[PDB]
């Protein structure tokens, strides 16, 4: 099928109108069935569990291993483990960030941001005013909102959408343009505009993060060796079930079900009077048990599917044994991309700050263009050594400022309220 | 079936009226059973149990190995093992906390409720005032409970059920509201609403804690594997028992029970006048004892059990073996696991602790909207050096304050105590 | 048949009929058996002795190994191996609380409890005034009383009832209630109150003990495994006996008793004549030994009945091996069950702490609200290196108080009579 | 077919007339397959899945193993994982390059630039001045431009083009020269002139950026290898499916369905009276498993295609072990790779701030020609120790000046930042 997404564009001047909305809600419900596969991969269905059945009396298993499970939330602990921090040097803005940071939650809201962006590709937030002057944001997945930019060089985006079916069947949705919000309402099956609502923000309320560029998973290019392990594994377990270990074998000779009764029991077998015409065999046959093939296919595709997605078996038994910095070696490529993906996150955040101020309630007309100073600091979760970070503290405090020194501790939260502790005791 | 669970929505404006209720009570008695499965596996039934009989004479062994019981308790020892410590700045909010934490024993509550959140998925938690005044909680398995959110992107809670049948065998119930608190009796059949108490609170009584955003329980997407290797290893202990280890076969010859009777003090065997026409064989056979494919096998599936859970198997033979850093390495994706976990107990522990301080009696109401200066640090549980703190405190008291000087030390309980001691001293 | 204990539930408001302890009497006989066959377990009989016997002459070997008694006493010796260690700021309370300690010898009594938790899953512990005003305490077996709980969702406790067979054949039994203490006597069948007694205490006299929330032993879950390695290994046991290890055959000539009297001083064979018309065959006959799928078998469900119960084997060949910290990881596990069970063993020390200075006798009235002061200090049973700790202690004296530094020596018993010897020095 | 691309050539004198674009622009419609082939290699697809379909029942199963994205990942992760930094003596200069970066959000630019130029070969730059008089920047993809140079011996560009079919159908473009810019519109099929606009630059608003000289991608070498590594991956995969494990031969008897219903279950096979004149034969197949052959070639292939492309296989078991530099040494090609881009990075960056501060309103006209001062620092992504570089600069604190040793640490960000907070503390 389809192994990325291109973006919409549509042309500046002409207007928005309803024929145009609807042919972006057909091209969109072409696309979904690609972000439904993706998400029924995680969630724990696999393909195999659909394969035909086989003769009713044959053993069929049917086994799955998950490895994008695994993959997400082993990358989503490696890159959002420890929540990020934002400072700034004037007091006031520095505040109010942390003030609204603290009230709308944005650890958690962060933390799904990047599980979605990891899943599907791509994925959405949306910031609003509630009813008590407030500054609120959501985040939703792709499979209900598209946004669609204009086709000049500097692609600026133009609006956007969300639908869905209502209670009793009917199509709902929200219009948002960089001016006015619209809500879409039908009835007997056409869209009709129903009503508008000013703007008090000065762009669109919907921002995009995406994943790469292309706004490709994690793991979709590694889907066809997943299937193949599955299918190898069950039938691996199919032919062990099958056939006993070891079998008797009794030719030109009567033997009775009785006599079989107590087998364990008695070690002495007997013909006392063997068939003149015919010859008597009694030996055991046993179930060959030599595999080779099926184990290096199945070591080979093992590797190969941790090697190219790019994320590192910490707990295979081959990993990195009794070294400083050979151990840290193997964490590169898993570094690597979470700093590419750094590169997208840092700008939608900025972005997002940069929105947040734009209101009088938030901060002074004064401070409003103040955005560029914000500056973040993002943190990897790896083993860490309290000692050492004590010794290089201390070695920096020789020929470093207060904050850097402190800044390297990692046991200390924040630098400000350690400097005012200690101007406070001294 | 079912591997995941979706919450309810309801419209805000309607009135809340019994077939509603009724409603949603059916479709919670449709999920039920997906609890009661999930339930069953832990407590140590399995399904390995409930196969078809085998034939009246041939051999049946069934033998269960518990993977869900050993994952639910080494995480939840990892997780809370030590017990949160919660502090902050005036003194009073403090004493409050503190006093109150002691007078409801949350340790045990907080154990359940993360023992509860790691099996089912979710977990819901009662609060209510006593008759002298005293605010309690308390934990409620989701069989029995569920609650229904709005249809607005902010998706704030609306109401919650809690139903049972009594002694006598009709429909007894409470209802939870936002500003009242309903009572659901029945006798006939139907319902009825029976009385209506204020709520003094100034939300809803029940809160929701989730282990993931699906609901999903820590090995719910393990249960195959687990299955096949049970079904496995009881296969083989089958297989071991039916046939013996070697036989003496003697074609030919007519030997009488009365000669083997002492077979094991005889060791000449003797043949005077063997017949004319006919051939004597004398000889042993053996059992063939040569596997290598259940072996494989089996290992490969306990690999993968242990390695998709993201659970470290700490006691096996092949470990991590004489390193400091790579034994931590190993651990790396349960501090993931928990830390992904950590998100959401400490926002459910923030909206906790942002009720509780709202009624006038706890707190005076200037402090009412201080719950935002409640400060939660988690610790997990791994072995420890002492000399090792004892040096970083000694290095770490030449820069940082006395109180950052004091956390890094285990063997502190409590920083204030140990402050108010040293004071006392000089 | 059943792998857990389910609580009684009774409403509060009605009265307590000789009716309904009959039924909770019947029903408690009905639970009766599991008990009775766990503590057969732990105590030394196993299920292999009552197997059906064979036939006469075949050879019959019933070898029993027994993994719960070491289990429970590993735990035990693990967890209680070292007292708990009691103390408060106020003198009189810390010394009332030893004084008391002391003359009632709560060690036993605390291990006992340990033990008995183990074992069949939870525990009762009764308190009770002598004759010269001093309070005492006993431990008891589930086996004679059942505690039942109220209806409410707090769950409080409600009576508890405690009966038993005397000397001539005819049931005598008490009944605890919150106010009255109730003598059961019964002569012809029937059950009639005998004797009211008031209740100088403030709650129930029974207090209980609970190893998990499900109330399940350490050894519930393995029983299955334990059965089959004892078959397996008496299987193997009855195999070596019966054969020889090698025979000869002689076919063609005649072989007298005489001659074979002395084989061993002999060591020539001659047959001079053989017959014309058959053929003369002489050899040896080796009995094979071959197996390899019984020791594997029987090394994996050793190494699984190890790993499911969470308890470390020590003494392994295969156990860490020359490491400092590689050996501390191996006891992980067991320290989390340890963690686990303090959680409700701690809690109800604190219930039984709170009752105990209920009376006057004990200490005044204004000190009776003071039991949220108590402070438990836990430790395990664990090699100790005495140099690094009193280096620890010369590090510690520097920054910590005299007492915190005094805690870490486990050479120190008491840190109160040390420090007032040190004061009686200087 | 083509495994370079080649500069277009053009005398300068004559003028640019639309036949001349026309045949560029043929030329160049000719040049497009090559890199649609290298955009779909990277994207996902591959040319395994275009191979002719098998027979109707025998298996047939497709491969694909990426190496395409994990080479450019990583070669990008390697060489821009941290921005670089530019700075300058004078204050203004670069107070105005650093605000323009920070403006600009030039990071994202830089690495798409980076990977565009990894995966065609050669990328190119655009720069216009917006509505509210600022400078941006902007990154195509070659497909849609190319740029032509002059027939001198310097080779000066000279013009470039950049085309597109429009929503309608119609092709629409722009043409950039030195001095004008010119719109190129055509409806019937043909091109006209629309309109002119001067240029504020002194020079082409377009720049190009080389991978090589000959303009190579980084795997356009090695896809021989990965396309024979797929096809045989395949091959075994297909092969190892076909047939089972072992089978069982009867020859001379008859076997019914209905007795091989249950063949787990019974161990015993008998032949009471075979056929008097054929033999009866019965015994075990199995398939033969002894491959060679095929694991050498795949470590051949495998070893060749890192080996080649000079990109380190980092998570390779056989990486390097327990060493210091021996680990430095096996990155050495990938830094050789990045030393030689970096030439050409450089000299196009050079370029580009030449021309942004040609303008009087970037800078006054006084330090237009101060280009010459610009200085950029270059570094990669390697694992880094924090206590070596805190050693390194109390070392060089001795013998160097404050910005050199501050510029060691890579803690610090910014030199000046931390020298104005240090004059600022005394």
Known sequence: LEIGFEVFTFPREEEITIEVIEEFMSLHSKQQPRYERLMKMYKGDAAIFARKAKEPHKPDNRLNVNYAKYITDTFSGFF?????????????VSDAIN????????????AELVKLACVYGHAFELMYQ??????????????????????????????????????????????????VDVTLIGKNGTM????????????????????NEERMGIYETVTALIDSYDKAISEKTNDVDYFSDSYLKVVGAMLSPEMIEKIRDTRVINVPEPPHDVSVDIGFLD??????????????????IYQIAMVANISDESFGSSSGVALAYKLQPMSNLAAAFERKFQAAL?????????????????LSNEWRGIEFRFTRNIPKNVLE??????????????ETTLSVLSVVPDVRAEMDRIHSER
């Not at 959002?80 to 006031?92: C, L």
């Not at 003030?99 to 962060?110: K, P, V």
């Not at 792709?142 to 069947?169: H, N």
Request: with cysteine; net charge negative; charged share 30%.
């Open 80 to 92: 959002n483990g420890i929540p990020s921090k934002k400072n700034h040097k004037n007091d006031v």
């Open 99 to 110: 003030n609204f940071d603290n009230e709308q939650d944005m650890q958690d809201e962060e």
């Open 130 to 179: 509630d009813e008590e002057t407030k500054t609120n944001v959501k985040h939703n997945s792709p499979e209900d909102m598209f946004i669609v930019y204009d086709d000049t060089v500097s692609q600026k985006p133009l609006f956007a959408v969300r639908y869905g079916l209502d209670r009793e069947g009917e199509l709902c949705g929200t219009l948002y343009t960089e001016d």
């Open 192 to 211: 009709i505009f129903g009503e508008e609502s000013e703007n008090v923000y000065n762009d669109l309320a919907v921002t995009e993060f995406i994943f």
């Open 287 to 304: 179930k060959p048990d030599s595999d080779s093939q099926t184990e290096n296919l199945l070591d080979r595709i093992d590797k190969h």
């Open 350 to 366: 900025t972005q997002r700050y940069k929105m947040f101020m734009s209101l009088l309630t938030n901060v002074s007309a004064n």
């Open 389 to 402: 970070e004590a010794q290089t503290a201390v070695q920096l405090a020789t020929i470093a400022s207060q």
